[PDB]
Ligand binder design. Sequence first.
Ligand SMILES: [Mg+2]
Ligand SMILES: [Mg+2]
Ligand SMILES: [Mg+2]
Ligand SMILES: [Mg+2]
Ligand SMILES: [Mg+2]
Ligand SMILES: [Mg+2]
Ligand SMILES: [Mg+2]
Ligand SMILES: [Mg+2]
Ligand SMILES: [Mg+2]
Ligand SMILES: [Mg+2]
Ligand SMILES: [Mg+2]
Ligand SMILES: [Mg+2]
Ligand SMILES: [Mg+2]
Ligand SMILES: [Mg+2]
Ligand SMILES: [Mg+2]
Ligand SMILES: [Mg+2]
Ligand SMILES: [Mg+2]
Ligand SMILES: [Mg+2]
Ligand SMILES: [Mg+2]
Ligand SMILES: [Mg+2]
Ligand SMILES: [Mg+2]
Ligand SMILES: [Mg+2]
Ligand SMILES: [Mg+2]
Ligand SMILES: [Mg+2]
Ligand SMILES: [Mg+2]
Ligand SMILES: [Mg+2]
Ligand SMILES: [Mg+2]
Ligand SMILES: [Mg+2]
Ligand SMILES: [Mg+2]
Ligand SMILES: [Mg+2]
Ligand SMILES: [Mg+2]
Ligand SMILES: [Mg+2]
Ligand SMILES: [Mg+2]
Lengths: 97, 146, 135
Amino acid sequence: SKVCEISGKRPIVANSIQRRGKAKREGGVGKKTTGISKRRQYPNLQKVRVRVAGQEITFRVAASHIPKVYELVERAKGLKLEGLSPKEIKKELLKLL
Amino acid sequence: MKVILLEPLENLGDVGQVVDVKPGYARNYLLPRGLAVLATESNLKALEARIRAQAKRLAERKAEAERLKEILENLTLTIPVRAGETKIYGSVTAKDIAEALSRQHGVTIDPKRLALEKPIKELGEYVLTYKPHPEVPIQLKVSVVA
Amino acid sequence: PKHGKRYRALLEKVDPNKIYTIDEAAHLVKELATAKFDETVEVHAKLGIDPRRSDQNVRGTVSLPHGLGFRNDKTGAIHAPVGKASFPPEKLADNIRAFIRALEAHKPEGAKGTFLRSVYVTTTMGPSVRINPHS
RNA sequence: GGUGGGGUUCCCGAGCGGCCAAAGGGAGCAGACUGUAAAUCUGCCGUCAUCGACUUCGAAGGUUCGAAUCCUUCCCCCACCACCA
RNA sequence: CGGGGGGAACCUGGGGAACUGAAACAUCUCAGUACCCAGAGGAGAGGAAAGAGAAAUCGACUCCCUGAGUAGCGGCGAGCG
RNA sequence: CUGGUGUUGGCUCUUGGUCGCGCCUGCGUAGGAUAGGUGGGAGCCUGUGAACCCCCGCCUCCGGGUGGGGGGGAGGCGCCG
RNA sequence: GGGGCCUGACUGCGAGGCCUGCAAGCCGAGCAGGGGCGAAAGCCGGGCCUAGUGAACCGGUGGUCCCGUGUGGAAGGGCCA
Ligand SMILES: [Mg+2]
Ligand SMILES: [Mg+2]
Ligand SMILES: [Mg+2]
Ligand SMILES: [Mg+2]
Ligand SMILES: [Mg+2]
Ligand SMILES: [Mg+2]
Ligand SMILES: [Mg+2]
Ligand SMILES: [Mg+2]
Ligand SMILES: [Mg+2]
Ligand SMILES: [Mg+2]
Ligand SMILES: [Mg+2]
Ligand SMILES: [Mg+2]
Ligand SMILES: [Mg+2]
Ligand SMILES: [Mg+2]
Ligand SMILES: [Mg+2]
Ligand SMILES: [Mg+2]
Ligand SMILES: [Mg+2]
Ligand SMILES: [Mg+2]
Ligand SMILES: [Mg+2]
Ligand SMILES: [Mg+2]
Ligand SMILES: [Mg+2]
Ligand SMILES: [Mg+2]
Ligand SMILES: [Mg+2]
Ligand SMILES: [Mg+2]
Ligand SMILES: [Mg+2]
Ligand SMILES: [Mg+2]
Ligand SMILES: [Mg+2]
Ligand SMILES: [Mg+2]
Ligand SMILES: [Mg+2]
Ligand SMILES: [Mg+2]
Ligand SMILES: [Mg+2]
Ligand SMILES: [Mg+2]
Ligand SMILES: [Mg+2]
């Protein structure tokens, strides 16, 4: 779980290519690969603490989607309860569909 | 990053203004302190709503202000007093002038909005000035044998 | 003041921010002569050449259409007389368009960048009028 | 192959447009000083040579009134970068 | 109210080798194979054009034949396609 | 290990770049010259306050260049040499 | 060995052979064009001769015009050096 609770962005697998030599575009013979290996790219995940009802609610988010967390507190009506949750905010309050 | 201000901020802006600020400043200072709120079209609409309900009910003030003003520049209020001559034994105070409307001509004024500043003694042609916000002079003459 | 009030009067007539047409210029240059005898009108241009080089020079001879009645210096600017301030507004416009298209001819190959970078129509004693040499 | 540097009196070396024989250091020659060697100090020092005159600054040309300076090119060195089927 | 666990193979998705080939070997091959994990279900997937691609052209997706070992791709090698 | 950039904000002082606009910048005694270049130019500038002493800035080949307020109250440059 | 003219250390090709596993290497009359030396016959496609050399791939550079992903271009290739 290095994963966005808003976007769902999760780490991905990317090759890493070691290239040598002069571009053909620059009048070289063109590039060579001296290696390819796997690696992950992570989402740039950050904490967002937010106060909703009387409660302090913490999202793990891609920095990309940090705004959405604040649009998500902007629909706040029916929870005087607890914990927990809510995070009843969450998916249902995201696109609802 | 655009934000609606909920209090005057000593530059930045003052209340209700839309000023555009660094998202860091916005998210970790302004918003959580209630000093601002987001410039969302939903909340840019709420402002625009409440921008209209001010300058409406402020033309409600001026509604019945320059309304009433235009009825009271066309009226003269005559009050009889037991005057002897040019010194009233009694006096006419603001609250009196008030009753002198509610009775004679059937109109009501504050009186606390009159600007008499100590009661009328003696007599003559009087012009005082009334309120709230741009407003009317009333003309009343204090007369004799009550 | 660095200029007499005679000139100071002329400094309120021109917004140098505006890029004028020659037609805007040739007419507005008549208000630009307060001198008690007849002024001479000049067209100046800073050029797209490096003069320090032998082959980047601009010079020739010109006979102006409306008659009298050019070479670049070492800093790459250039100056010649187009006529007199007595000439009619239309008799200036044709003498301005005479010098403009006269210089364009002489452009050296090694000229790097635009040939007319700035063109100011002035008078002998007058202020600078920033104009569009292409209009 | 590229970019940045350079070239100067015997070695070095600054070096400027308002002219710089062109600062200075050293070497060299002649002078004083002398235990030795040196240090210090004086003139010589591109050259003819009499003030002064005449070349000269990598090279050729060019700008300009004016070139050891600015410019185009050539040339060689320094340096760094990159590339190689 | 629902889930949970199981199922020969088949399916999708998340991950993912190496021997080997290149008569050495590193890009490349083997191969998105083996294998691990999650899930679906009698199938699964895909699917109703922000498609093709040269014609005023076709008309969702899947599957077979063909196009074709073509077009390409390639230490322009092995080979892939 | 490290530059940029995301998370990442308030207030400042300090600079470098460039573009623009305003303003000064410059000397061989030699032209009386203490002249940056090239146009146009014998004429402007001025008692909307000049030459000039007086404080004052900054520059300086230290001669002057040279602005800031004014006392000052008509002259001062140029062709002409 | 010396001297006078010149630059064929040409372009387009090439009968036919030497050699030879392949690939290569070698010699070459003769035609065409345009030349050079000679009065001319003629000679000249480097040097008395046999070593002074390196497939293909990938790129550089100058051409030319051949291809130019719907069309004109361009990008990028090809061809020749
Ligand atoms: Mg990488
Ligand atoms: Mg945070
Ligand atoms: Mg993003
Ligand atoms: Mg973003
Ligand atoms: Mg930001
Ligand atoms: Mg001795
Ligand atoms: Mg002795
Ligand atoms: Mg089930
Ligand atoms: Mg199951
Ligand atoms: Mg998979
Ligand atoms: Mg998964
Ligand atoms: Mg799999
Ligand atoms: Mg392997
Ligand atoms: Mg192996
Ligand atoms: Mg092998
Ligand atoms: Mg093998
Ligand atoms: Mg082995
Ligand atoms: Mg594969
Ligand atoms: Mg299962
Ligand atoms: Mg199905
Ligand atoms: Mg289905
Ligand atoms: Mg589906
Ligand atoms: Mg494959
Ligand atoms: Mg000058
Ligand atoms: Mg043969
Ligand atoms: Mg012939
Ligand atoms: Mg002959
Ligand atoms: Mg032959
Ligand atoms: Mg190969
Ligand atoms: Mg074509
Ligand atoms: Mg296309
Ligand atoms: Mg096309
Ligand atoms: Mg091409």
